Amino acid sequence: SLEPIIFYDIPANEPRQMAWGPNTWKTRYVLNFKGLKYRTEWVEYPDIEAVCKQIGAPATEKKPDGRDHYTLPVIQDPNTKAVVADSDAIAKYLESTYPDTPRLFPEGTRAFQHAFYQLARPSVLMPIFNIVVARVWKLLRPRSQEYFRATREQMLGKKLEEIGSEDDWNALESGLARIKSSLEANGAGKDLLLMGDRVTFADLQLASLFIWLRVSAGEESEDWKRFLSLHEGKWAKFMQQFAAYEFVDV
Amino acid sequence: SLEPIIFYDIPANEPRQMAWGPNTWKTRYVLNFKGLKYRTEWVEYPDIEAVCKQIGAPATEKKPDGRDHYTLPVIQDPNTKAVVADSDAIAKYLESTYPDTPRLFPEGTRAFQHAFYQLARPSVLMPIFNIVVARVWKLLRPRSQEYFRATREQMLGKKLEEIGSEDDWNALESGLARIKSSLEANGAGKDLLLMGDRVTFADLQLASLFIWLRVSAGEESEDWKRFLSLHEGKWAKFMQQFAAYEFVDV
């Protein structure tokens, strides 16, 4: 008797790529993993601010000029009238509001999980960004394309085509090497999940970076094939754990 | 009836500064916190390789030339004949070998703790290094001084006196800002320990960086006073939790 949660995500111009975002995938992973009923409302980049304002979703940050900056994912929960932005806030909301669903925040782990993503962001998200950003622009619909190109380039001071070198693959490998040695501190048979034998939001956050690569580059691309080869296939084994949680409603 | 564990540490030319090292303090904190009986064997920098070889302590890493590099802390446990190097390995050894002592590795936390120190090292250890490295050289005894200067400078390609600028305090503040926001994910009243209401090795690792600053710079220095002021005194409150675990046997 629960009404579907409305989940706001950014579409693409090809069905296989409809769900592509690294941050929106954090929320889709949580929704899927927790087994909550939802529907995706697909929102183009330049329409994000408008939709947020229209539903009372807060902005998640300020621009360099101090002006409000609105981002997805956002969810609207008809069952409680909650409207929540930012994937971390959304995860904790769902944990708290649907306590019967599978837990992603075991006690005493919230700082550790937060710190983990602070390590992953610069060392894994940033290299993957450089690797895929041109192909991201390519998979977006036209109104989204102009907004995306204009924003990212203004920030990067560089044409999108001029980003994405071999230095990025080196940096990615090094960041993953540190995550690999962290996982290994759990000991053999426990070294594919941060807590060894259960999934946390932090694991899904890492997976979100990986699936962003796979969807942007293409599951059959040389780039994805190269990723699956890193560290004797460890991240292939990592991602295989989350295959059942990748449903997209298109 | 337990015999004291022998703990190898690097001395200084002033009693207040005898225990100064960021890594050796990780082991001293663990020994103190766990309430284990120990004695410090004080070993000068150039004598570390010799002492290690003499007691069967392994090297913890290789130099750029691939040659073995021996470091302290090391412990020798007469009760089991164990000789263990590297502060992480030493902590886990003590956890495992003395299970009745206060726990520092709760289940499911080993990867999270490892990842946390990977975040702290570049963002907190490295800025503090730049800040104190000249005063570190200053507090060492003469044979240690030459070794320390020669090694660090060969690595830094810069005289020790030319290191330590305002950029370092900015970088330190930014690294601590990220750790601060991680701790705050635990919620109010739980935001001074990574797990909120218990101490882990990861907390002691952060404390080791802080006490290194305090001992190197001096508890009364402007630099230590400045550290205690950062973030409305949060790190002062953090360090106050570990005051009872700072016994030094000099």
Author numbering:
A (entry chain A), B (entry chain A): 2 to 251
What do the study authors state?
Most of the GSTs are dimeric proteins, each monomer harbouring two domains : a thioredoxin N-terminal domain containing the conserved GSH binding site (G site) and a more variable C-terminal α-helical domain (H site) usually involved in the binding of the GSH acceptor compound. The fungal specific class GSTFuA is particularly concerned by this expansion. As assumed in our recent report PcGSTFuA2, PcGSTFuA3 and PcGSTFuA1 share the same structure, which contains distinctive features when compared with canonical GST structure: (i) a new mode of dimerization, (ii) an original β-hairpin (β2’β2’’) that inhibits the formation of the regular GST dimer and acts as a lid over the G-site and (iii) a supplementary helix (α4’), between helices α4 and α5, that closes the presumed H-site.
The structure of PcGSTFuA3 was solved at high resolution (2.1 Å) from crystals having the P6122 space group with one polypeptide chain in the asymmetric unit. The V-shaped PcGSTFuA3 dimer is roughly 5° smaller than that observed in PcGSTFuA1. In the active site, Ser-22 (PcGSTFuA1 numbering), which catalyses the GSH addition on ITC in PcGSTFuA1, is present in PcGSTFuA2 but absent in PcGSTFuA3.
